[PDB]
Amino acid sequence: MAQDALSDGFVRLCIDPSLNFFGEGCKILVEGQITDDATAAENVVTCVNSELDLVERFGQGSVLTESLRKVFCMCKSGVSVYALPRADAAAAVSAVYTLTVTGTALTDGRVQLYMGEAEYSLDIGVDEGDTPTQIAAKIVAAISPDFPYEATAAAGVITLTARNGGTIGNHLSVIYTNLGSCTSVTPEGVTVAFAQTTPGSVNPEPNDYASVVNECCFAVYVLSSDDTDWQENLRDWIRSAWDCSKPQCFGHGYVFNKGTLGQVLADGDNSAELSRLALPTTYPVLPYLTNAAYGALSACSTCENPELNVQGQTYGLLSCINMPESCTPGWEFTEVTQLQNNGFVVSGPATTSGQGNFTSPYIYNDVTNYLRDEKNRPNATFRDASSRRLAAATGVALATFLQQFNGLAVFTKNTNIKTGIIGTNLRLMLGKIRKWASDNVGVLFSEFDNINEDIQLVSDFDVQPKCVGQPGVFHLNMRYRPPVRGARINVNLVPALFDN
Amino acid sequence: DNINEDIQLVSDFDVQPKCVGQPGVFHLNMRYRPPVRGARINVNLVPALFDN
Amino acid sequence: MAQDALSDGFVRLCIDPSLNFFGEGCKILVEGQITDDATAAENVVTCVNSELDLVE
Amino acid sequence: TTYPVLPYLTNAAYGALSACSTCENPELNVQGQTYGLLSCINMPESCTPGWEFTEVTQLQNNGFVVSGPATTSGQGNFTSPYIYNDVTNYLRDEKNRPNATFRDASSRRLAA
């Protein structure tokens, strides 16, 4: 039994509210810790298809699953997500914090605490007085399973210990939002204190990228760790992906650095391959969540066109992260200027107030840690990440163009081509290359300073000594500039008065 | 390279000793090269920044 | 493998913003005093490549 | 050692491509992603190439034909290989002198 309009089988109808027409966007790789209850294989890259399989595959409340949660939040489409799970060192210890409640509530109301991120913050209320600290600590009825820490729920005071060992858990921050003036009435006589009691000690230091990411290409690398040694290994891998010794894969990596001004400036190892997210000691959010948000935002979820800058309050808004409002900005303006001038990406809140509501941050500058070329000359050639993106795009675009000369007859010495032959020579190849370069002014390039000096073609015979040059081998030199864009306006405002 | 040295033709009477050569027998020597074609291009790419 | 456009090995790409196309222009000699903390050999003509090797 | 395909199938495909479907004009080189694609062979994608680039360079410089896949990924889908260099095993000379007279397979066809 069938239906008339469909019975003959000319139209074959399929109804599915879960199909996706989008093609396979670029690739992003996320690397972080896992836990024992994970079912994914250690030290092996895998593909992730949606939010839902986390925890089962990558463990409960582990760093990697939390990072992937933001990665899949900033990208509704146009990206492919890959994961590189890592395991904790066997000797690593877990950091410990104590949240000691005190007093005895004597007025009814609500108490709402901020923990790590807006998702892990909870609002819990009490409807009667005379509740001791024992009736307090009922918070555990609200703490989510995904919180990266475990609450002991002891006798009146709850202790917090990280799930993943090492220094990564050494960053939890707890804030009493309603302690100050607010429109929500807080129980009177309640005082909650937060303090640390033990740090982490050991972090894993894998050095095997050449075996797990051997040849597959990735666009953005996100590393959920704060260890300088691990970051240097990733930097070396990206160096390798760009070296001229063999065909290149390119790519750009994102890391963070938390500390005081004098400490953060000590991590500037002139890395053109890294964007370093400088954060202060008093930062109220888990750093790797912000790092993952920035990485996933810049990972072609916006950059389908490589020349776009991830800046400002529109194209650089990390809308997946929420932090409470505060008067203190985190960095002073002079500290911000120093960080920006030394090669660190600085973020800030989208609004300021003392009421303590939730706000999202954004990014002031999209910069790489590059400050000096290989001859130690300071310049801004690779100051912006868009410069690296454009260099990668130009390399591929130029490589595709030159393919037409592969297998084409080449005439040297006597350069007269007999009628009917299919071939070329140096002068005609140079003309075609110049024409292609000129056609691209406005897309890849800015106008050329002197096109007669920027592009040069020579044959291997002209270079090598007699009887050593190989036949059919050519050398090309090309110098170029990327397009310019508005950066700043300095305004002088002079209020006069009506006169004469 | 040099057509005058790359092709040479000689008769048998010129080569074999006297009274041993044969009539209507020739020796030809030819040297040639195959055609050349594009093989590789070495590209140096030197990014800069707008100045002056 | 790397990337499809660069995999076959016909085009071998090098990206280095510190390269120079200029040939060697003719030479100039600079003669003057040094100090005891310099690491250069006295009374020996040597080439200088950039402004930054100085002092030491 | 880790080649994931039956060795003789690749050899047969290469020979069939280089014999008739291409070389009725003897000066063509069976290389690249267009004129040297073995479209009748499919193998899963892999992050590992089988040969490191230095090994590839050594094999090429020692008179061996090397090949690789047309595309790379970790998902494991099917891809076809192609020939990097269409080269014979010729080195040295009948008088023991290194030269490249018969380096390319098209040289033999042109000589014939």
Next chain:
Amino acid sequence: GNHLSVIYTNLGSCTSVTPEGVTVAFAQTTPGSVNPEPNDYASVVNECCFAVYVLS
């Protein structure tokens, strides 16, 4: 025949749901020993022109 290779594509996670609890292992137990070595080309390919030879 000493060259067979068997690969489990969906051992790692993929868009195809591999049943859980299933594992397949592959190994060799006995190799080959002897191959033919004919030397009679002069009688079967006697003066007939072939452009390409394939040896499987």
